[PDB]
Structures are given as C-alpha cells and as structure tokens.
Design a protein around this ligand. Sequence first.
Ligand SMILES: *[C@H]1O[C@H](CO)[C@@H](O)[C@H](O)[C@@H]1O
Length: 36
Amino acid sequence: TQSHYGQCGGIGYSGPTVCASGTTCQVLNPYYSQCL
Ligand SMILES: *[C@H]1O[C@H](CO)[C@@H](O)[C@H](O)[C@@H]1O
C-alpha cells in the first residue's frame, strides 16, 4: 500500500495503488495521484 503523500496510482504508475488506512487516493493530476 502507498503511504500518506505518496503517489498512489495515477496514469503511468504501476506501484502501490491502494492507500494506507486513513488516506485517500486523491487524483491531483491524471498521472499524479496522491494518498491524502
Ligand atoms: C498499507 O496497507 C494497509 C492499508 O490499510 C495499511 O494499514 C498499512 O499500514 C500499509 O500502509
């Protein structure tokens, strides 16, 4: 899972897409999504 302020899963990202407990994957940009 991705940590707080980490890139969860935007377009082009293939790593830890599921955010940690208490954080939501906020799509800041189509490619940049951050666990907030
Ligand atoms: C991601 O996996 C779980 C998701 O809730 C977290 O509890 C864990 O700490 C890790 O960051």
